[PDB]
Design a protein around this ligand. Structure first.
Ligand SMILES: COC1=C2C[C@@H](C)C[C@H](OC)[C@H](O)[C@@H](C)/C=C(\C)[C@H](OC(N)=O)[C@@H](OC)/C=C\C=C(/C)C(=O)NC(=CC1=O)C2=O
Length: 213
């Protein structure tokens, strides 16, 4: 019996939009670093719920396990990075994932225009956007203890949407789904994923698991 769902479309802040276009339209040779950025983000999120629980144990009612799961899907061509971290509220998503200017955006673009390696992205605080080196579309599903589950999404192009997620409920955390570009499918390969995690994400302070098939 026909479901009615609310959607809200937002405009990326000007420089974030320019950064996304720079990332998508320019050739870079070390694109694999996108995973290190996403895993670092998940690690950051896990630290936050970890410390918050020390002060309030009920914060783990939504789930005690603190870990990261990597899920490649060769059928629909998606690579999903999941964490049981702190998660983000609707306000968190809208504010921190597009709408508000970030201080390192310009500096990073300057660096890139000068020939800096993309690997540098994390030092500028805009590392999430490196997802667009390999994905044509990114969906961020998230659940924070203080809000309902939400889905953010963008195929770049200057806008992003936010809507309540009606997919599989998550206890708490964030799930980044990368809809990979046709020539970036190597990241759906178990050997390649293991290779890059070993190379760049060896000191993650939480267990990571790769689910194959
Ligand atoms: C201070 O921390 C970081 C910030 C500032 C700000 C966004 C923090 C955020 O505020 C709501 C939460 O406190 C934090 C726990 C959530 C994450 C890191 C999310 O990752 C997962 N898995 O939760 C990430 O994924 C969509 C969201 C935004 C990341 C952006 C825009 C980025 O490019 N760089 C950043 C890396 C950071 O470490 C960044 O901006």
């Amino acid at each position: 019996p026909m479901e009615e769902e609310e959607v809200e479309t937002f405009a990326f802040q000007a420089e974030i939009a320019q950064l996304m276009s720079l990332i998508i339209n320019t050739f870079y040779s070390n694109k694999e670093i996108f995973l290190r950025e996403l895993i670092s983000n998940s690690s950051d999120a896990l630290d936050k719920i970890r410390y918050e629980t020390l002060t309030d144990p009920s914060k783990l009612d939504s789930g005690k396990e603190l870990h990261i799961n990597l899920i490649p899907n060769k059928q629909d061509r998606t690579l999903t990075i999941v964490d049981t971290g702190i998660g983000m509220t609707k306000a968190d998503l809208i504010n921190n994932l597009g709408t508000i200017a970030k201080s390192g955006t310009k500096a990073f673009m300057e660096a890139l225009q000068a020939g800096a390696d993309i690997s540098m992205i994390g030092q500028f605080g805009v590392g999430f956007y490196s997802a667009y080196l390999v994905a044509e579309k990114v969906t961020v599903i998230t659940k924070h203890n203080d809000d309902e589950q939400y889905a953010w999404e963008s195929s770049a192009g200057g806008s992003f949407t936010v809507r309540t997620d009606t997919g599989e409920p998550m206890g708490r955390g964030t799930k980044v789904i990368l809809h990979l570009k046709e020539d970036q499918t190597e990241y759906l390969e178990e050997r390649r994923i293991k290779e890059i995690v070993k190379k760049h994400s060896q000191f993650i302070g939480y267990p990571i698991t790769l689910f194959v098939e």
